[PDB]
Amino acid sequence: APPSIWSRIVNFGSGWGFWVSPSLFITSTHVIPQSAKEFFGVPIKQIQIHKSGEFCRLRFPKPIRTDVTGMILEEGAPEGTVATLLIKRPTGELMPLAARMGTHATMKIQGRTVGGQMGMLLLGTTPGDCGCPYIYKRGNDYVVIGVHTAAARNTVICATQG
Numbered sequence: 001a002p003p004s005i006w007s008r009i010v011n012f013g014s015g016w017g018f019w020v021s022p023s024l025f026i027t028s029t030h031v032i033p034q035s036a037k038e039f040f041g042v043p044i045k046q047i048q049i050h051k052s053g054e055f056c057r058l059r060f061p062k063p064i065r066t067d068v069t070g071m072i073l074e075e076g077a078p079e080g081t082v083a084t085l086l087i088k089r090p091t092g093e094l095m096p097l098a099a100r101m102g103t104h105a106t107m108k109i110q111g112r113t114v115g116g117q118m119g120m121l122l123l124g125t126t127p128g129d130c131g132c133p134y135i136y137k138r139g140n141d142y143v144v145i146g147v148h149t150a151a152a153r154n155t156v157i158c159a160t161q162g
């Protein structure tokens, strides 16, 4: 992925989030800092925050990332698609991970209702990785399909919009 794509991934609370477009930031719900007063310098009351299970959209009142184009956001990928989980680490290291996406489902994880799509990793994910995006290339378009929310020892769970 080009630097433009990686630059959309930004640390956010205990994990990460992803700029889909100049005004739209997505992340995993459980990652969002509680009792934060502002995100990216914007008071929280001015942000439109919509949670769909563990998929969270934050829509800012003015464009924040005017440098980025709006990317296609879809609810998961067709079954069998090998997506890339774009992991950033706090050291700065980039760790793209290939994951074959499987069935869509809604299930409880540690008592929380999670709608998303499970994948299988093809050197793994760690507790600080949630909120990183799943993307794949469809023709000449990059498509973002969800955010990293959970993993087991090679199942990964991509939370998707409802």
Ligand SMILES: *C(=O)[C@H](C[C@@H]1CCNC1=O)NC(=O)[C@H](CC1CCCCC1)NC(=O)c1cc2ccccc2[nH]1
Pocket (backbone or CB within 6 Å): 015, 030, 054, 109, 110, 112, 114, 125, 126, 127, 128, 129, 130, 131, 149, 150, 151, 152, 153
């Ligand atoms: C991000 O916060 C982490 C990333 C995981 C940690 C371990 N490897 C990863 O990729 N996410 C979690 O730890 C989730 C937290 C849940 C909180 C409530 C909302 C849904 C996510 N939990 C797990 O990843 C998890 C729970 C669990 C239980 C039993 C077996 C495996 C297992 N994995």
